[PDB]
Amino acid sequence: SSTTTNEKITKLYELGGEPERKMWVDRYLAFTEEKAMGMTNLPAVGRKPLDLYRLYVSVKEIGGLTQVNKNKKWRELATNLNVGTSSSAASSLKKQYIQCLYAFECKIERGEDPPPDIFA
Numbered sequence: 001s002s003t004t005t006n007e008k009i010t011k012l013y014e015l016g017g018e019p020e021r022k023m024w025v026d027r028y029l030a031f032t033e034e035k036a037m038g039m040t041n042l043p044a045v046g047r048k049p050l051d052l053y054r055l056y057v058s059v060k061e062i063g064g065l066t067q068v069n070k071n072k073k074w075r076e077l078a079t080n081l082n083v084g085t086s087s088s089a090a091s092s093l094k095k096q097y098i099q100c101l102y103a104f105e106c107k108i109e110r111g112e113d114p115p116p117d118i119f120a
Contacts, residue, residue: 002092007049008041014053021053024112028052028104043100045093046083052100054081056108059097065105068097 011026032038043050058080059065062073075090077097083089101108111118 002046002088004041005044005047005049006041007044008039010043010050010052013049013051018053021056024104024108025050025052028100028107031103031107043096045078045081045096046089048081048083050100051081052104055097055100059101065101 009026009029011022011029014022014025028043032042041049043052045051048054055077058077059068059073062068062076063071067073068077072090074094074097075085078089078093079085081093083093
């Protein structure tokens, strides 16, 4: 069945070269453990684990967060990360995409964007 990859963390697939993404990704995990939402793997897909980095660069090329909500990009990103592309893969990756990002989307764009003199 679908289920989640045996990989709880994600910073593992990137130890050097991506200090920015490994940090945000490490925080996302520290965020899930913060509310005890799941000390185990949860935002993992069929094959590969989270792939937040590959999903972050893909979502940007996709067009944004709103595009992946009405442009049938759920099956696209699903095919980009190799998960199935059949049917349930899109619906699964859809919930996994929002589970991974969404709250993180605001924790990566809103405020994260170089404080535009934003009250600072």
